[PDB]
Design a protein around this ligand. Structure first.
Ligand SMILES: Cc1cc2n3c(c[nH]c(=O)c13)CN(C(=O)c1cccc3ccccc13)c1ccc(CS(C)(=O)=O)cc1-2
Ligand SMILES: Cc1cc2n3c(c[nH]c(=O)c13)CN(C(=O)c1cccc3ccccc13)c1ccc(CS(C)(=O)=O)cc1-2
Lengths: 114, 107, 106
């Protein structure tokens, strides 16, 4: 579907996050072989990344804005769960997530299809 | 504000009474709970009791500030605990409700 | 250009960052937004991204051209959308700020 809320998430939230200087670890699925993370998929059962979210927005995959919001949330939460508290990637995720939440605070309130 | 009243009377009210909310209704007492590393790892403790009181005392200026406090509380949980701990699943469940209700926050 | 300077550094700066600006920051994409009739109804599309680029490149010959582009943008929204769409309220809010700022232009 195409809704006011999903348009906002695409044109405002994803636009802001995708071009952020900390976005690059998150723009594609984690490649556990490339990154040397042999237990990644034992710990993280629902991988998510902003490339996948962006494609779903582009392809009208989502039915409700909350579904997109949950994908963003899963992506951040995966990072906090998997990594050590002191890893810089945690700081990068926190930074992006704060922007996510700041932008979501102004999202259109009542979702209706376009 | 309209938004802060929604976060207080709609979002928090729903999370507060949830069956998974009880670990989050007051600050983590690391001594009582036997977590001597908790405050070495978690530098910004947050909980729903603290957020609720801040909502009651007009502490916030904007809804986003309150949303960030919710966010910190959940994130602390994912950062501090082992992936396999039940408390992680409890936080996830609550955070999904938080985001669902936030989606419908008025403008 | 003092007027165009004002339109760029005061009017566009306020409107561009307003929380209601996001539907107007780029051209309407009738394909991606699924609106087969948009260009049958709206003959002169306009948006704040185009206006902003024109101010930056010294495109306009007079302030009135820039103001008319703002006006066209808002009018397209009112003509195309249903009266109850939130976007109509968003355009009304932005246009009132536009006119308020225009009254104090050199
Ligand atoms: C979600 C995610 C992304 C990455 N993740 C890693 C561990 N866990 C994760 O969740 C994770 C391992 N990883 C890092 O730790 C790392 C991060 C950021 C800056 C760095 C600077 C120096 C060294 C490492 C890093 C890197 C390295 C590079 C790429 C980009 S790409 C095109 O190659 O895939 C992605 C990740
Ligand atoms: C955010 C938070 C809250 C608690 N946390 C714990 C570890 N890390 C955390 O982040 C955390 C340690 N903790 C437990 O491990 C625990 C054991 C047995 C059953 C459980 C069921 C659900 C959740 C936790 C447990 C308990 C125990 C009790 C209370 C409530 S109270 C008034 O008595 O202090 C809070 C926590």
């Amino acid at each position: 579907r195409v809704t006011n809320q999903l348009q906002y998430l695409h044109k405002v939230v994803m636009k802001a996050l995708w071009k952020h200087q900390f976005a690059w670890p998150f723009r594609q699925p984690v490649d556990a072989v490339k990154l040397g993370l042999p237990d990644y998929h034992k710990i993280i059962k629902q991988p998510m990344d902003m490339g996948t979210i962006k494609r779903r927005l582009e392809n009208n995959y989502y039915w409700a804005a909350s579904e997109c919001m949950q994908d963003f949330n899963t992506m951040f939460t995966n990072c906090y769960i998997y990594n050590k508290p002191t890893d810089d990637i945690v700081l990068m995720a926190q930074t992006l997530e704060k922007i996510f939440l700041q932008k979501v605070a102004s999202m259109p309130q009542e979702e209706q299809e376009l």
